[PDB]
Amino acid sequence: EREEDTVRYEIVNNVAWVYYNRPTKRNAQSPKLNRQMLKVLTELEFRDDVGVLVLGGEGPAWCAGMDLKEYFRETEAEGLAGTRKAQREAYTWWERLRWYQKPTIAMVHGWCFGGAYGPLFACDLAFAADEAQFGLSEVNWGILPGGGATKVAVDLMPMRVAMYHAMMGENLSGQDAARYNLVNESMPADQLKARVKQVAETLIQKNWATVKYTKDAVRRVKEMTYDNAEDYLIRLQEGLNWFD
Amino acid sequence: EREEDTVRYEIVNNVAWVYYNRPTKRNAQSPKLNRQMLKVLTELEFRDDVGVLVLGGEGPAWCAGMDLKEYFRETEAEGLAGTRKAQREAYTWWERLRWYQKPTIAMVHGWCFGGAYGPLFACDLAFAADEAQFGLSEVNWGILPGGGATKVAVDLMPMRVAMYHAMMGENLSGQDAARYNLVNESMPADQLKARVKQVAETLIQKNWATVKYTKDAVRRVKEMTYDNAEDYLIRLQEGLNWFD
Amino acid sequence: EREEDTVRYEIVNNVAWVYYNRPTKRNAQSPKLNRQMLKVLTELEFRDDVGVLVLGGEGPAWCAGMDLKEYFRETEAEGLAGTRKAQREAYTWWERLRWYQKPTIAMVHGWCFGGAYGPLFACDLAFAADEAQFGLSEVNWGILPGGGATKVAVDLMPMRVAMYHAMMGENLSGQDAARYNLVNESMPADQLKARVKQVAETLIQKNWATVKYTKDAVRRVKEMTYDNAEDYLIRLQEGLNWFD
Amino acid sequence: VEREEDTVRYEIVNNVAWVYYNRPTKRNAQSPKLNRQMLKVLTELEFRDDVGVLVLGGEGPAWCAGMDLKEYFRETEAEGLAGTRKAQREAYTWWERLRWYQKPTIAMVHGWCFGGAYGPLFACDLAFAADEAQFGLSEVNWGILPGGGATKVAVDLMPMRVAMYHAMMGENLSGQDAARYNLVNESMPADQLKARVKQVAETLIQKNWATVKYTKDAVRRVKEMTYDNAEDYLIRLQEGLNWFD
Amino acid sequence: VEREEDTVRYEIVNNVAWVYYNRPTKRNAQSPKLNRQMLKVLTELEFRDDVGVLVLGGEGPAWCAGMDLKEYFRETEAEGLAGTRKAQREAYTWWERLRWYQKPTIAMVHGWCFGGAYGPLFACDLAFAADEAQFGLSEVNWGILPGGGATKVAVDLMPMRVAMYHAMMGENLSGQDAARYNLVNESMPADQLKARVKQVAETLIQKNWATVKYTKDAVRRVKEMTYDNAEDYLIRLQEGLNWFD
Amino acid sequence: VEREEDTVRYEIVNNVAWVYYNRPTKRNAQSPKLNRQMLKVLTELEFRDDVGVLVLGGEGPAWCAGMDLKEYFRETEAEGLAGTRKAQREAYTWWERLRWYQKPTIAMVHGWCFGGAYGPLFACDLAFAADEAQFGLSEVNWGILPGGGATKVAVDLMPMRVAMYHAMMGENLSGQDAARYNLVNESMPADQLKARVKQVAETLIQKNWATVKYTKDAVRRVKEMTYDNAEDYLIRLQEGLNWFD
Structure with a gap:
């Protein structure tokens, strides 16, 4: 519903904990979320009291990808101009995050699919729960992986792994994601928050x-x-x- | 003997199972095999009933590399023109396979040496038997690895592994090949065919x-x-x- | 003290065993060591009786990086000219080693930090003791990693690992270094010398x-x-x- | 010059958008105000079905003298890094928008083109200069590197020797020299420029x-x-x- | 034009292979027949000990008007993807053969050079044009991208502005303009071209x-x-x- | 020519270092002796507070005829690989030093500039030629590739067609042709060269x-x-x- 409600955050001990906030829609990236995320990231970036940003998600998913109803389907209805405007909103916030003034950490507790790979790569470091799932299921819907995810898979994982990932559309567990260096580490879900907190509070001391x-x-x-x-x-x- | 006999294939359930067919010469790539392989791959590529290609080998080897008698030794006997013609026959079929219209799988049950690395890389996915052996033994004969194999080792494996592989000329087992991402997976030889069949029959459903x-x-x-x-x-x- | 004493070597069975020789200063790279190392490497390179070079270190460290007193602090005291001269002495010997006429092996028994990553990368192959430690601790002193070490981490390790390595300044064990392909292998310290000797004596037979x-x-x-x-x-x- | 919306003008005539820098007394220097308004104008025009080609011109005797030192470089480091990075992004974003524009783009360069003007100059697909136009990277004389990626613009358009002299010496090129070294497509007397740009824009809209x-x-x-x-x-x-x- | 083996001619004189496109009534358009025969001719000549240099010329008033729309673009998508990909490979393969030829190569461009002709033009090491020659990428006027990698040919040989105008406007360059923008080495009156190409080929065979x-x-x-x-x-x-x- | 320290001369006048190749009877060919002395001279001058610009000229009627065949190519493979690699490193190292020099660099090319001279020519930021200067890669006539990365120098400075003719044909370019194809910034009568280089060096030291x-x-x-x-x-x-x- 309200664009301002698609993203939440808290500053704790100089750490900006930023959350996707569409927990009932698996934190899918709608145009509204894309505009609000740029707004939050822009306002936090140059704060002298924000030393590190953590990107997490409300509910069972981190980010299930792009919201096919608002972002792909409803946008195309206003044509090229609509498609391009919605594309630019997603790409520009992934880029602002990728070149963020402060260090960035992905805290990935559940589903990370498709167009979530942009934000995942844009975070300098990434920690997953064992129970997290990573996938590029787009091949099964007849399209290319969303949001440069092909390039994310190729820049982080061994070529043979990226190829299987894209072609077969099967998920990697938290452990597999760590093993193939999509993320830094995997651990049980009940340890994730404390490991990320520790990493964040180490960086703000540098x-x-x-x-x-x-x-x-x-x-x-x-x-x-x-x-x-x-x-x-x-x-x-x-x-x-x-x-x- | 007969050029038409150097390569075999079968279409089963929309899968082209293509085999090197010089089982007594460890499926070495002779000019005859190079011309016939291009011919088979060209005829199969745009068939509406062929959804995936599997490249396997008859006998104990997948491909022991280039046939030094027919390809390196006998060719050079007709000089530059002969060398260049034989080079082009090998490189052009590796390239046609690498950019194949259909998805390609290497089913590697045994020896994979030297100039076999071109075809290995040209297959999008690769599954090995544990008992398979992968090597660039050329350093021991005083030459550079055949057929761009140096670039194959560097694009698939970690730099330190590629360097050892090229310099020491020692073999990687099926398991080591998987571990260093030369291939997607290794499994016992008696499971290989069924895993590849399953992968192939999954892709034709996309x-x-x-x-x-x-x-x-x-x-x-x-x-x-x-x-x-x-x-x-x-x-x-x-x-x-x-x-x- | 004496520039000629900062580096030691022995030729045994056509292998040049070259050692950093500042064991009391953790083999830190001083301008004196930088000039002497170029001198030794230059004299050994084209010897018909030297088939392989091994780079090791005296005392508990392989190389703790650049000597902050002689190389960074004392040099800057004579300004740009001094900084540039000292920079060129370090970079030119790493480059001569990286393109060495003979095969090169790093035998890394202990501390390998910061500006040691240049020489580490310049060695074609690398073997570590389990008890070795690898680190880019520069982030903790407020500077960028010494001597192109960022590029060394990125060309050898998975991007996510290189990023953590640079940002957090924590050490990798011998085993972790092998796992992430910073080095070829890790083994207990009392096995290291014999494995390196075996690798070296295999290469001189090619x-x-x-x-x-x-x-x-x-x-x-x-x-x-x-x-x-x-x-x-x-x-x-x-x-x-x-x-x- | 002073209200944000006045810093840029345009007209659309026969499916050509004629966009003009509009700070003529400030020789069309790119201030944060002009940077923000230019993005909004280019964004509104890009996907119109009635815009086939965009011409970028300037009011007064300058095309664009570069960045507004007083507003873009000062009154921005006033707010430290956060202000520097915001003003930088406003400039780089609209150059990027123009460089990858949906419609063909033409620079109509009648006068002064200096410094940070080189980004928009390169972002235009085609460029036509007056003989009396002057192109320069004078930043070396002010002790700084050329503004807004201009070094890269000179290296991608001109021969390396010419780019090297251009950056190091900070001397101007005439319209005729800018055509000769392929900074622009063509140079002609100022009284002919508009008719030639019009003819090119009309040729493109028929395609x-x-x-x-x-x-x-x-x-x-x-x-x-x-x-x-x-x-x-x-x-x-x-x-x-x-x-x- | 109609039998495959007639679509290309050559003579070898004093270790120079003079190869001519031979569909003069079709202004030497590259049909699949010509594409296949050109590969066979270039392949047979490449490693002869008595061929020191190859000159690529054309019969009739054109060098090469581009791809044969009627045979190469139509009667190929007739057979869907498989036919499109086979005709594409025949064209791209012989351009590649000429580009990396064992012997030096010279384009002798007396007349029309358009579209997909740019691949062979670039595949020649050297190129000499008649003043009356015309070079163009008119594909924009037909609603398609330039044929046979021609965009890349224009970007690797000419200054970016010139390449941009060339692709967008679809206007022709004279032989003299093609020399000026370094699409070719030199331009001269048509009655001098053959003697100049002969002199270059004879200079190269002595080396x-x-x-x-x-x-x-x-x-x-x-x-x-x-x-x-x-x-x-x-x-x-x-x-x-x-x-x- | 014969004592190592005599192979290069310089004077510093008004913060300009005027460095001259000094084997005039050997047309300033780059011998190992000259290669070692040039590095020592460039190294000593680079970071002086009283050197603002370096001009590289030559004594006698040549700028630099290339590598000394007799000392650099022969009396080096005399010592096998070790001698070849040492002489190579001496040449490539001082070209690199000049290419990334702390101070701006100017080539003052009055005469012959051939072969391995192209490395120093490119390592200079700016270059000014006499009309009577001659630039060439004659190595094709001697059966070898151009010396000292000269192929890359021709490809980075000149249009590809021009670079291709230059390497293949081994013919000379006049000073005027070298300016036209942007191997150098400018060409002028020999009696004007020194005054123009002086004026550029004096302009740079004020910045x-x-x-x-x-x-x-x-x-x-x-x-x-x-x-x-x-x-x-x-x-x-x-x-x-x-x-x-």
Whole structure:
């Protein structure tokens, strides 16, 4: 119903705990959620009292993907202009999260499907419950994986695993997701919150500027030659010298 | 002896089971096999009753590599023209398989060596028997790995593993091959056929066009920046909308 | 004290065993060590009696990184010219090792931190003791990882692991380092020397030219498209035909 | 100049959107106000069925003198990082919108084009200059790097030597030199510019609009691909155009 | 035009293979028949010890007007995907053969060069045009993307602005404009073209054929490499040439 | 020519380092002796507070005829691989030093510039030629690939067709042709060259030296990046320049 209600958050000990807030719709990404998430992330980003952001979900799912009724079906009804506007709302918030000024953690307790892979990749670190499920079920509906999820699978997992994942549309458990490096770790659901809290409260004790430069450097040197990456990392250290 | 006899196949339940058919020569890739394999793959590719291709081998080996007598030794005897013609016959069928219209599965029950790595990579998915052996033994004969196998090792396995594999020329078991993501899975030899059959018969139940677009997208976004891969995957979905 | 004493070596059975030799300073890379290491590596490289190089360390550490007193602190005291001269001394020896004419093995028995990642990556193969520790603790001192270590973590380990490694500054054990393919293998410390000796004495029995071409090809095809890598590997084999 | 909505003007005539920078007394410098209004104007026009081509011009004697130093660079680091990052995003976002615009785009450069103007200059598909136009990256003289990705604009459009002199020396190129080094398509006397741009925009609106979009996007994209990858990509583009038509 | 083997002609004179497109009444449009015969002709000639250089010319007033719409685009989607993919492969395969040819290659472009002709134009190492030659990508006017990777050909050879106008506007370049924007090496009056191409082909056959091959391949390859990677690659190329000689 | 320290000369006048190749009777061919001395000279000058710009010229009628065949190619494979690799490293290392020099660099090319001279030519940020200067890659005539990464130099500076003819045919370009194909910035009569180079070097020393360094490095670097990655990179460069100033 109300756009302002699709996303919730709490600041606790300098950690922004941000939640998808459509628990009855498996936290599907509707245009309303896409606009509100950009709004929340934008307002939190440069707060001097927010050192780390955690992205979680209300109810049994983390994020079941794009809301096919509001996002794919209802949008296309107003044509190209509608499709493009709704596309831009989803892509721009995934990008703002991916390049966030503060370190970002995905806390993935349940369903993570399709167009949820964008936000999953946009989080620097990711912790799953064993009972979480990760899947690209789009092949079974006759479409390509949502929201660049193919590129997410290829940049995080071994090529053979990404290929099976996309082609067969079967789910990975929390443990399998960790094993194939889609996420950092898997643990029982009742341990997840405390491990994430511990990771978040460790990062806020570091120099926040250093953590930003260091996480951007990992993402960036992935797309350079070794020889270009060496010169780049020196140029980044020079810029870090100026922020600090 | 006869070029037409170097390759065998059977269509069963819309699956093309294609076999290397030189069981007494460990299914080594001779110029004759290279020309016949292109011929079979070309004729099967666009059949409306062929939804998936499986590449297997007769006898104890999957493929022991290039046939040094027919392919390397006897060819060089007619010089550059001979070398180039024989090279093109091997590379062009690996490429036709790698970009095949239908999904492709390697069913690897035994020896997979050297220039077999091209066909192995060209198959979208790969299942091995535990008793299978994978190796790049070329370093021990004083040459570089056959048929782009160095690039196959680097695109599928962790750099440190690819380096050992190439430099030491030792074999990986079925289990090791799975562990380092050269293949999707390893299982006892007496379970292999049934697992592959199950995978193949699952894919033919999907939209064949979607599976094609989805497998090409995995291979392609491996060689793009994240930002270019996002725009590309939208352009692919537009093309899929037209095939279907 | 004496620049000539910062590095030690022994030739045994055509293997150059090269050691960092500042055991009391955890083999930290000082400008003196950087100049002497280039000198030793340069003199050993083209010896017809040296078939493989092993890089080890005296005392409890392999290499704790850059010597903050001599390399970072004392250098900056003579400004840009001093910083640049000291940078070039470290980068040029890592590069000479990375492209070494002979195969290179890292024998890592203990601490491997920060700017040690350059030399670690520059070794083609790497074997660790279980009791070894690998870390990028720089985030905790407010700086980026030393000496391109970010790019080393990204080229060897899964992206999610590299990200945690850089951001949290926690150590990986020998076993974890092997599991995430920072090194080839981990084993108890009392087995390390004998495994490395065995690997080294296996490589010197191969055609030394072939091993060189084969190790350079792994490093190079990592930064090419599959289609460019195929043509390149043929051009390399043509050059190998000429050396031999 | 001072109310946000006045900082940009447009008219649509015969399916051509004529968009003008509208801070003529400030030589059309890109202030945060102009950056926000330009995005809103380009966004509203992009998908209209009655807009076939967009022309980007400027009021007064400048096309665009670059970024408004007083509002965009100062009154922003006033609010620290958060203000710098917001003003940066407003500028980079509308250049990106124009660069990947649904409709073909034309720069009509009659006068001064400096610094951060190079982003919009490159974001236009085609560009036509007056002989009396002047193009420059004077930022080296102010002790800073060229604004708004302009170094990359000079490297993608001009020969490397020319780009190198352009960045290092901070000297101006005439309209004729900008045509010669392919910063723009053509240069002509100022009194002929509008008639030539009008003729190009009218030629484009007669073509299949969806074909023009796929074809202009193809040129931009295959610049960053290997030949072998570009061959496949262009086939995939044609299949999407088949659907979109 | 109608029997497959008649669709291409050649003569070898003084170690120069003079290959001509031979559908002059169809302005040498690339039909599946011509595509298959061209591969067979280029394949037979490539490794002859008596062929030092290949010149690609055309009979009649066209070099190549592009793809044969009637045979290559229609009578192929007649057989659905399988026919489209077979006709595509026949065209792309012989362009690739010519692009990586063992011997140096020269385009001799006297007349019309349009659309899918750009693939063979780029596959030639060198190109010499008549002043009266015309180069164009008119596909935008027919509602389709340029045929046969031609967008990439225009982007790799010409400045981006020029490539952009070329694709979007579908207007022709004269021989003189094609030389100016480096689509071709040189343009000259039609009555001088053959004598100039002959002089270049004769200059090349006096050089070390293996050296010419490694050197032309090096130019093509280092275009897609970083400077630092190109430095190593060129050393590795010299070591292969040492062996091959 | 014969004592190592005599193989290079320089003077520093008004914060310009004028460095000259000094084997005039050997047309300034790059021998191992010259390669070692050039590194030592460039290394000593780079970080002086009184050196704002470096000009690389040559004594006698040549700028640089390329590598010294007699010392660099022979008397090196005399010592097998170890000698080849040492002489190679001496040449490639000082070209790299000049290419990434702390101060701006200018080639002053009055005469012959051939082969392995192309590495230093490209390593200079700017280049000014005499009309009577001659640029060539004649290595094809000697049966070898162009020396010292020169193929890559021709591909990064000139249009691909021009680079292809240059490598394959081994013919010379005049100073005027080298300016036209953007191998150099400008060509002028030999009696004007020194005054023009002096004027450029004096213009650069008035600018903020740290700004010139970041800006010239930006041009070189964003050539090997996507547009989207270049936009972020240039922001990161500005933040480093903020610190370094």
